[PDB]
Symmetry: C3
Subunit: 145 residues, 3 copies
């Protein structure tokens, strides 16, 4: 079985064994979430979303349509994803940009990921980074101060 | 009519037709929100706040006292506004700084807007930018890495 | 007495007189919170956490295990703390890194604080800063654009 907090709104049935979804989360019906994930408080997870096994999503994260998270990924608190490069209110793209966070990668707290980004297997993104280009597998990337 | 989610705390009656306010939002009594807005999950909207028509506010945004959003604005997820330049706990300003986001402007995800800022009509703020100065109409501004 | 909003999940009994905890907050049982604090909507406060008196925590803040906030601190909205320098999903540190925010300090909106950080008494952190090193008492630090 899986644990959905009474104070979460989880509409998806596609949730693996051992997954925990905490207070004040929203998960829309088509989201797929694997086994032994931890979806911490105050997250939003849209429809066209795939999340693998053993994924940690810390508080305050939104996973939009077009985002895939592979197995063993860590997403730090308040990490921000995007799916529209030139957003204008009520101008809906024909297709959302796809982001994929590959197996074992980690995204530091409060990082911002631009649309269409690939972060490679076991990469490490520094806290507060802005990721405007793909990050190669096993690379440590941060936005220098 | 307008749609207020049962899991939102909306205290304002000043909400235009076609507006949607989603889960875990707080809207205080004096907030004014126009028609056909989308206030996504996990937002906070204070009292001395004016929001126009056709405004998109993505998840995780707080709109403080002193902030005005004009029509057709897009506010990306986790965009942060401010109204106190030198904040000290329990030292309440006599007047909050005013921010105005002008018609059709778009603010990228996880941008930070300092107090007293004007963002001009149809401007585009890059994801993760820090906006310390006014942005002219139709200008694309981002914080270079 | 103290004020816990009906839409908060506060599990701690260790809350001082005059403290307000607002909608959609989570506070875990061992958290200690002093007198006359304001914990604004959408915050998360873990177990191994000490918060002093007269502390303002604006919306969207998570205070992790290992974080201490002293008296009279201001924490701006969406300020992000961290306690694990090299996070990997399901790889739990033997010890979390400790952060201490010293008396009267202020952290600007949407700042990111790396693990193990001391911010000195009455320091001022700019909105959107990334704090990778200790900040001396009374110093104004921001990440230049
Ligand atoms: C990026 C990193 C992994 C790198 O650590 P590291 O490789 O040991 O780098 P380092 O040796 O500490 O620092 C090297 C330099 O980069 C800077 N730096 C490190 N992290 C940075 C960041 N996130 N942004 C900007 N600069 C950074 C340091 O200030 C240092 O600068 P100087 O050489 O000028 O002193 C780490 O700092 C980090 O950001 N970790 C993520 C923490 C996090 O978000 N955890 C998840 C939340 S808690 O579970
Ligand atoms: C700012 C921008 C509109 C600009 O796109 P653009 O004008 O096509 O710029 P670009 O040609 O992609 O990039 C030009 C340079 O600026 C950099 N850049 C682009 N966006 C940046 C940002 N947000 N912060 C820092 N640098 C940025 C690129 O890395 C590139 O650098 P090099 O020239 O060194 O390669 C876009 O990158 C962006 O930030 N969009 C907002 C996305 C968003 O937040 N959407 C809302 C959430 S989803 O609805
Ligand atoms: C850091 C500061 C306290 C400094 O204000 P200040 O010392 O008067 O600096 P300033 O004179 O305005 O600006 C000096 C320079 O630093 C830059 N700057 C100021 N704040 C900055 C920030 N947060 N990040 C990057 N640059 C910043 C300015 O752009 C200016 O650059 P130029 O000299 O190139 O013009 C203020 O800008 C700030 O960040 N305040 C926090 C606001 C906040 O988060 N409030 C809490 C939420 S509302 O309660
Ligand atoms: C009890 C409870 C937990 N949670 C979430 C947030 C807690 O931080 C988290 C605890 O679960 P866990 O021990 O499996 O922690 P993880 O979420 O796996 O994160 C910890 O371990 C990582 C390796 C990193 O070091 C990270 N910084 C840590 O927080 O679960 C809620 O959101 N609400 C709750 O009520
Ligand atoms: C069903 C539901 C929706 N919502 C919010 C968040 C969803 O992303 C949003 C969907 O409404 P919508 O289709 O009108 O989307 P918008 O909010 O208008 O944003 C989309 O379109 C923009 C032009 C940009 O491309 C943006 N990146 C997109 O997300 O509504 C909730 O918060 N909770 C919910 O339960
Ligand atoms: C009524 C209500 C208030 N609150 C929180 C958020 C409101 O901003 C806050 C109001 O309490 P307060 O007047 O004691 O304000 P503070 O939280 O102390 O912050 C204000 O004063 C500071 C010195 C800075 O200038 C800051 N920018 C201001 O917002 O309480 C909720 O989260 N939900 C609510 O329903
Ligand atoms: Na943020």
């Amino acid at each position: 079985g899986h644990m959905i907090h009474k104070l979460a709104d989880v509409q998806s049935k596609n949730i693996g064994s051992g997954t925990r979804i905490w207070q004040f989360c929203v998960v829309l019906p088509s989201a797929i979430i694997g086994e032994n994930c931890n979806i911490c408080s105050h997250c939003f997870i849209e429809n066209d979303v795939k999340i693998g096994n053993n994924v940690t999503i810390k508080c305050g994260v939104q996973i939009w349509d077009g985002i895939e998270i592979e197995d063993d990924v860590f997403i730090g608190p308040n990490v921000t994803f995007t799916n529209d490069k030139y957003p204008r209110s009520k101008q809906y793209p024909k297709e959302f940009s796809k982001t994929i966070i590959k197996k074992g990668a980690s995204i530091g707290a409060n990082a911002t990921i631009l649309p269409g980004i690939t972060i490679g297997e076991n990469a490490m993104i520094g806290a507060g980074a802005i990721v405007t280009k793909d990050v190669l597998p096993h690379v440590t990337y941060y936005s220098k101060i």
